[PDB]
């Protein structure tokens, strides 16, 4: 009956007509299903005062009809009036398809880096850092890091590991993830080398990092730098162990490449154990 | 070439040895011996040194085949 | 504020500026707060007493000027006020003829399926009393069986206000339908059959249906041509789609194992 | 609610998503072993 | 926790579709 | 199985087939059916 | 006490054993299929639901003193089942308290202490993983809580204890039901609560607040997916709006949710009853009377139940709105004797050309029409009082003059009898045509291409239906 108010042509009746739209849109579902063209009308005016609200209640009524992309495209035209509301079962279902549409978009965009990509909304990452604001309220950042792997975006992956200080081991746990369920190898090294950036920002180097990363990334100068660091702070305990692990794990021509970067004492110590002769005859001894 | 198909199963699935008895369960029960042969080696190279007892359950009619 | 509840109601309303004052009166009441929750509070029902009354007289002035999309607009908001969930509001003495205006309008524009489902909300007023509502439902009963002439002989008896702006449309949408029956293959008659069937001996209505319809008077003989089509047929037309149907027979026998 | 606001926000997204992913894996396993036994019949015919 | 469960249900679903496709071929093959 | 919509519910042994077709049309069948012949 | 007090020991004896082992086998077997074989539709879920409609409503209404159902509340007042020792210790509590209640008198709630004996079932370390156990064993004491029928201050205890359950119901929905999906049980739980919650809001103010809830409840159903959820909630949402005598039907005309797509032979039969009444009130008589016929012939498997006599009640009216009528009272009942006499005598006057009897029995039996909710026949069947004969004549005769149909319809006027025949052919009552040249009204042509062109347009559905039986057979075949 308030579509009769939508027929008349003054603005101060419109805003009290649309205020009554979303108030009873949950109970008077199919009445608006015929007045769809009137709203998508009222929407197309650039002189209309609440056109972004008309995209909200259109997204409400296509949500009833099951037209999910029509609620999606009008959530794009909704502005900040949509995402300022966040505690509903309505809002979480059509941002679910929004993440779903976006994460299948970037996998398609990862196939063609040379231009020819798509124009993209920016509230879809305005809810990402909002979810990070929830994770700031949560202390549990394992959930925002999940989409951060899925979204193929790595600066938010760096922002969430340069977060409010709670463990380096959480990042190590994320690194496991890269050993078990990581499928592609094209961006795997990028994830695997942005982990060793924050490791060089971190105070202690690990074992399983270079046991995973640098044999999958074959940088012989990088382990020759970080072990020279382990020489530099006089730490011959863990430099001694990672050479035996590297001699067991890695392959030919990479041990030959790193031993060139050695000479580029404890130096003659790591000549003999990266040649790895003494490990063989003690293994022959057993 | 049909053998080198069913022999290559262990090379791509040895990291998770649990799926290998489920997928070669009926590959061991074809009609030609060549598929059944590479099925037998696929149990040998997917599961490396496990005391599986499910693959061993599969190998017991495999060592009791008519074909040598 | 409280603008002319009986300002120009009783004697005459030739106004166009009080129509703008009524337009401003709509901008007053429907911008006060709202009418949606309606929990209790007879004091905030007091403007709901007046919001009914200004839309009643708004519907009075609408049929006084014959605006068709406006008359359904005011009546829907009036029907939305009898769609009140907490209806403690007392019986306005204009309700039965106001619904009779709606009952006659919605009969006139061929909403006959909407006619009978409208009659559910009337419990017992159709039988006991209420000739304002009893007259259009006796009218629709006259349209039921075969009785065209009892409609036009009850034309000279309306117990209500004049109802003329609806029943001119109501009978016009009757006349063209019988004209739609006679614009079929019923070939030729004289003016006296147009006097018997249609109505009216010697009025410019024979000029009306000479220009709207055909019906040229020849040598004291009208003319209406054949509206029958040729019916083009082949009857082997479904040869493609019958060949389609047998494909998904075997497609649903094989291929889905 | 440190966890309660987020169990509906960033965990209700996942656990509602894995629900239908659990249903279809449940569904195909009933469908697969049916296909298994139907193949074991025809192989028992041809080998005999 | 939950991200690892969602990845494994993605993997296992696309796994047994492939072994469903194998039995579709063999039952089609044994008819011939 | 209650469905919440059930709160109410040759003598004539095969009568309604006879009665729906013929009701009460002078069933002695002689006074008009056998007695047309006075007209001719 | 020497007469009835000595016949007090036999009541408890049995029902303390075999009625107790009902939910013991039900709660055990539902847990067994909730854990493994998580597609748990095929269990005693269905037969217990047929029992909770039939058996345990009439197995007990009162709590059956000397501790048969009176003991159920102090029995289940202490239910943790939390960890494996908390299961095995409660399994000892399943041994000890059933021995005490089988021997002596335990804590007898005096019909008002049932709600604090529904607190410690929800309390006392109760679980969320045993969500069938919480959902079933809370809703099953609500039927002694409602069918006590005293209806004084327990009505608000009805209102509290359902919203206790429905807060657990919604939280389980917003609780991620892993691999159980209680919706298969929670649908008729949402029905059985809202049958009497509709009664409560008939004994108090209106139940549009239920519909505002049930709109949101229908929203979270089938957006997840449908497992009987869209089917049950739609007939619940449709019933109030049909129960309200306001406008309410064009709301249902625009209700585009017309796919429950399966209903286990019980929701679909009553769903076709409601929408058959809807298409009858907007005067589409042909499609209405065939889906009313489909509703009557789909689920009649009862013993003189009454709603079968109600779908049989509305079906004869719309057939009198199109002329034909079969034998109706050939399945006469001790209660159908009340309801056969108006309608059989109604069509008695319709078939004859008598209207004075038709107006007399309206006046005689209008108050019975008030109980059936069918006032509208007098305004819309007086149409077919004149149209039944012209359907009967045009089926009998083949090429009739309009001068003779005037006396045969006893209208005594040929000039308007053209218009009655014109209206019937306008409405498609008879397919015949009129010769307006010398007064001929001839019928249709001979039997047409019916032997040649038609029958494949019946054969296509019967191919498609029978192979889908073959498809639904093969897909659901092998559980082992």
Swiss-Prot record, chain B:
PC repeat coordinates: 4-36, 38-68
Superkingdom as given in the UniProt entry: Eukaryota
Family, similarity comment: Belongs to the proteasome subunit S1 family.
Description of how the protein assembles with itself and partners: Component of the 19S proteasome regulatory particle complex. The 26S proteasome consists of a 20S core particle (CP) and two 19S regulatory subunits (RP). The regulatory particle is made of a lid composed of 9 subunits, a base containing 6 ATPases and few additional components including PSMD1. Interacts with ADRM1. Interacts with ZFAND1.
Primary role: Component of the 26S proteasome, a multiprotein complex involved in the ATP-dependent degradation of ubiquitinated proteins. This complex plays a key role in the maintenance of protein homeostasis by removing misfolded or damaged proteins, which could impair cellular functions, and by removing proteins whose functions are no longer required. Therefore, the proteasome participates in numerous cellular processes, including cell cycle progression, apoptosis, or DNA damage repair.
Name of this chain's protein: 26S proteasome non-ATPase regulatory subunit 1
Organism of derivation: Homo sapiens (Human)
From Swiss-Prot, chain D:
Intrachain disulfide bonds: none
Subcellular location: Cytoplasm; Nucleus
Residues annotated as signal peptide: none
Family: Belongs to the AAA ATPase family.
Subunit structure: Component of the 19S proteasome regulatory particle complex. The 26S proteasome consists of a 20S core particle (CP) and two 19S regulatory subunits (RP). The regulatory particle is made of a lid composed of 9 subunits, a base containing 6 ATPases including PSMC5 and few additional components. Component of a complex with USP49 and RUVBL1. Interacts with PRPF19. Interacts with TRIM5. Interacts with NDC80. Interacts with PAAF1. Interacts, in vitro, with the thyroid hormone receptor (in a thyroid hormone T3-dependent manner) and with retinoid X receptor (RXR). Interacts with ERCC6.
Purpose: Component of the 26S proteasome, a multiprotein complex involved in the ATP-dependent degradation of ubiquitinated proteins. This complex plays a key role in the maintenance of protein homeostasis by removing misfolded or damaged proteins, which could impair cellular functions, and by removing proteins whose functions are no longer required. Therefore, the proteasome participates in numerous cellular processes, including cell cycle progression, apoptosis, or DNA damage repair.
Protein name, per record: 26S proteasome regulatory subunit 8
Source organism of the structure: Homo sapiens (Human)
Lineage per the UniProt record: Eukaryota, Metazoa, Chordata, Craniata, Vertebrata
Residues of the full protein shown: 11 to 58 of 406
From Swiss-Prot, chain E:
Segments crossing the lipid bilayer: none
Compartment(s) of residence: Cytoplasm; Nucleus
Disulfide cross-links: none
Entry superkingdom: Eukaryota
Oligomer status and interactors: Component of the 19S proteasome regulatory particle complex. The 26S proteasome consists of a 20S core particle (CP) and two 19S regulatory subunits (RP). The regulatory particle is made of a lid composed of 9 subunits, a base containing 6 ATPases including PSMC4 and few additional components. Interacts with NR1I3. Interacts with PAAF1. Interacts with TRIM5. Interacts with ZFAND1.
Function: Component of the 26S proteasome, a multiprotein complex involved in the ATP-dependent degradation of ubiquitinated proteins. This complex plays a key role in the maintenance of protein homeostasis by removing misfolded or damaged proteins, which could impair cellular functions, and by removing proteins whose functions are no longer required. Therefore, the proteasome participates in numerous cellular processes, including cell cycle progression, apoptosis, or DNA damage repair.
Family affiliation: Belongs to the AAA ATPase family.
Protein name as catalogued: 26S proteasome regulatory subunit 6B
Species for this entry: Homo sapiens (Human)
Gene name of this polypeptide: PSMC4
Shown segment, full-protein numbering: 39 to 70 of 418
UniProtKB/Swiss-Prot annotation, chain F:
GO biological process, one term: proteasome assembly
This protein's UniProt keywords: Nucleus, Proteasome
KW Methyltransferase (keyword) present: no
Compartments where found: Nucleus
Organ and tissue specificity: Expressed in limb bud, craniofacial primordia and skin.
GO cellular component: cytosol; integrator complex; nucleoplasm; proteasome complex; proteasome regulatory particle, lid subcomplex; protein-containing complex
Subunit structure: Component of the 19S proteasome regulatory particle complex. The 26S proteasome consists of a 20S core particle (CP) and two 19S regulatory subunits (RP). The regulatory particle is made of a lid composed of 9 subunits including SEM1, a base containing 6 ATPases and few additional components. Belongs to the TREX-2 complex (transcription and export complex 2), composed of at least ENY2, GANP, PCID2, SEM1, and either centrin CETN2 or CETN3. Component of the homologous recombination repair (HR) complex composed of ERCC5/XPG, BRCA2, PALB2, DSS1 and RAD51. Interacts with the C-terminal of BRCA2.
Matches recorded under PANTHER family: 26 PROTEASOME COMPLEX SUBUNIT DSS1, 26S PROTEASOME COMPLEX SUBUNIT SEM1
Entry's family note: Belongs to the DSS1/SEM1 family.
Protein's recorded name: 26S proteasome complex subunit SEM1
């Amino acid at each position: 009956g308030i579509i009769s108010l939508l027929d008349e042509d003054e603005p101060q009746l419109k805003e009290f007509a649309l205020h009554k739209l979303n108030a009873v849109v949950n109970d008077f579902w199919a009445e608006i299903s015929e007045s769809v063209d009137k709203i998508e009308v009222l929407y197309e005016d650039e002189g209309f005062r609440s056109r972004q609200f008309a995209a909200l209640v259109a997204s409400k009524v296509f949500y009833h009809l099951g037209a999910f992309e029509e609620s999606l495209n009008y959530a794009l035209g909704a502005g900040d009036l949509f995402n300022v509301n966040d505690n509903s079962e309505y809002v979480e279902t059509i941002i679910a398809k929004c993440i779903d549409h976006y994460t299948k978009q970037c996998v398609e965009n990862a196939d063609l880096p040379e231009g020819e990509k798509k124009p993209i909304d920016q509230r879809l990452e305005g809810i990402v850092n909002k979810m990070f604001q929830r994770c700031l309220d949560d202390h549990k950042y394992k959930q925002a890091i999940g989409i951060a792997l899925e979204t193929r975006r790595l600066d938010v992956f760096e922002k969430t590991i340069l977060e409010s200080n709670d463990v380096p081991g959480m990042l190590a746990y994320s690194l496991k993830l890269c050993m078990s369920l990581m499928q592609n190898k094209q961006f795997r090294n990028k994830v695997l080398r942005v982990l060793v950036k924050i490791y060089m920002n971190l105070e202690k180097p690990d074992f399983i990092n270079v046991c995973q990363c640098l044999i999958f990334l074959d940088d012989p100068q990088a382990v020759s730098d970080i072990l020279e660091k382990l020489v530099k702070e006089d730490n011959l305990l863990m430099a001694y162990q990672i050479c035996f692990d590297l001699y067991e794990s890695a392959s030919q021509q990479f041990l030959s490449s790193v031993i060139q970067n050695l000479r580029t004492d404890q130096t003659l110590k790591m000549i003999k154990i990266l040649s790895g002769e003494m490990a063989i005859e003690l293994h022959l001894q057993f | 070439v049909r053998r080198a198909a069913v022999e290559s199963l262990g090379f791509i699935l040895f990291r998770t040895p649990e799926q290998c008895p489920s997928v070669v369960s009926l590959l061991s029960e074809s009609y030609n011996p060549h598929v059944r042969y590479g099925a037998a080696m696929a149990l040998g190279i997917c599961c490396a040194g496990t005391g599986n007892k499910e693959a061993i359950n599969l190998l017991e009619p495999m060592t009791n085949d008519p074909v040598n | 504020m409280y603008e002319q509840l009986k300002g120009e109601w009783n004697r005459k309303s030739p106004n166009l500026s009080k129509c703008g004052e009524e337009l401003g009166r709509l901008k007053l009441v429907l911008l006060e707060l709202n009418f949606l929750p309606t929990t209790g509070t007879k004091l905030t029902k007091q403007q709901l007493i007046l919001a009914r009354d200004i839309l009643e007289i708004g519907a009075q002035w609408s049929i006084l000027r014959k605006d068709i999309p406006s008359f359904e607009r005011y009546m829907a908001q009036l029907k939305c006020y009898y769609f009140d969930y907490k209806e403690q509001l007392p019986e306005s003495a204009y309700m039965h003829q106001l619904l009779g205006l709606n009952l006659l309008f919605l009969l006139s524009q061929n909403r006959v399926a909407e006619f009978h489902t409208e009659l559910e909300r009337l419990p017992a007023k159709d039988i006991q009393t209420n000739v304002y509502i009893k007259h259009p439902v006796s009218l629709e009963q006259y349209l039921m069986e075969g009785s065209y002439n009892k409609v036009f002989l009850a034309k000279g008896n309306i117990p209500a206000e004049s109802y003329t702006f609806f029943i001119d449309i109501l009978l016009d949408t009757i006349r063209d339908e019988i004209a739609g029956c006679i614009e079929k293959a019923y070939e030729k008659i004289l003016f006296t059959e147009a006097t018997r069937i249609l109505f009216f001996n010697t009025p410019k209505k024979m000029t009306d249906y000479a220009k709207k319809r055909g019906w040229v008077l020849g040598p004291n003989n009208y003319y209406s041509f054949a509206s029958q089509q040729q019916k083009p047929e082949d009857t082997t037309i479904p040869s493609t789609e019958l060949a389609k149907q047998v494909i998904e027979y075997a497609r649903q026998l094989e291929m889905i194992v | 609610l440190e966890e309660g606001k987020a169990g509906s926000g960033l965990r209700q997204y996942y656990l509602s998503k894995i629900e239908e992913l659990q249903l279809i894996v449940n569904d195909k396993s009933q469908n697969l072993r049916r296909l298994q036994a139907q193949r074991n019949e025809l192989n028992a015919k041809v080998r005999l | 926790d939950l991200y690892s469960r969602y990845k494994k249900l993605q993997q296992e679903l696309e796994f047994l579709e492939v072994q469903e496709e194998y039995i579709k071929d063999e039952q089609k093959n044994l008819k011939k | 199985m209650s469905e919440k919509k059930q709160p109410v519910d040759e003598d004539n042994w095969d009568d309604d087939n006879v009665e729906d077709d013929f009701s009460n049309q002078l069933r002695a069948e002689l006074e008009k059916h056998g007695y047309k012949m006075e007209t001719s | 006490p020497p007469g009835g007090g000595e016949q007090e020991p036999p009541p408890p004896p049995a029902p303390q054993d075999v009625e107790m082992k009902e939910e013991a086998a039900t709660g055990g077997g539902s847990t067994g299929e909730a854990d493994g074989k998580t597609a748990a539709a095929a269990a005693e879920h269905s037969q217990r639901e047929l029992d909770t409609v039939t058996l345990e409503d009439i197995k007990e209404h009162v709590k059956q003193l000397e501790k048969a159902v009176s003991g159920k509340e102090p029995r289940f007042v202490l239910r943790a089942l939390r960890m494996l020792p908390s299961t095995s210790r409660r399994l000892n509590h399943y041994v000890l308290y059933k021995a005490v209640q089988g021997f002596f008198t335990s804590n007898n709630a005096t019909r008002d202490f049932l709600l604090p004996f529904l607190e410690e079932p929800m309390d006392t370390e109760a679980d969320l993983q045993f969500r069938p156990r919480t959902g079933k064993a809370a809703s099953t004491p609500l039927l002694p809580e409602v069918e006590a029928y005293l209806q004084l201050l327990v009505v608000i205890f009805m209102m509290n204890s359902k919203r206790y359950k429905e807060a657990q119901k919604i939280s389980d929905d917003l609780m991620q039901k892993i691999s159980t999906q209680n919706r298969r049980a929670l649908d008729l739980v949402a029905a059985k609560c809202y049958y009497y919650h509709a009664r409560v809001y008939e004994f108090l103010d209106k139940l549009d607040v239920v519909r505002s809830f049930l709109h949101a409840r229908l929203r979270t159903a089938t957006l997840r997916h449908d497992a009987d959820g869209q089917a049950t909630l739609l007939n619940l949402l449709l019933r109030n709006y049909l129960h309200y005598s306001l406008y309410d039907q064009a709301e249902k005309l625009v209700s585009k949710s017309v796919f429950p797509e399966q209903a286990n032979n019980n929701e679909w039969a009553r769903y076709l009853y409601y929408t058959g009444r809807i298409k009858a009130i907007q005067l589409e008589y042909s499609e209405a009377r065939r889906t009313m016929t489909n509703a009557l012939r789909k689920a009649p498997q009862h013993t003189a139940v009454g709603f079968k006599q109600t779908v049989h009640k509305l079906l004869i009216v719309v057939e009198l709105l199109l002329g034909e009528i079969p034998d109706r009272l050939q399945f006469r009942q001790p209660s159908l004797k009340r309801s056969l006499m108006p309608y059989f005598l109604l069509t008695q006057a319709v078939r004859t050309g008598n209207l004075a009897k038709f107006n007399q029995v309206l006046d005689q039996f209008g108050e019975k029409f008030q109980a059936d909710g069918t006032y509208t026949l007098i305004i819309r069947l007086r149409h077919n009082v004149i149209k039944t004969g012209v359907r009967m004549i045009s089926l009998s005769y083949s090429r009739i003059s309009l001068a003779d149909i005037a006396q045969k319809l006893q209208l005594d006027s040929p000039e308007d009898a053209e218009f009655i025949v014109a209206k019937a052919i306008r409405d498609g009552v008879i397919e015949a045509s009129i010769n307006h040249e010398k007064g001929y009204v001839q019928s249709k042509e001979m039997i047409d291409i019916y032997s040649t062109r038609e029958p494949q347009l019946a054969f296509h559905q019967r191919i498609s239906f029978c192979l889908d039986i073959h498809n639904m057979s093969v897909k659901a075949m092998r559980f082992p």
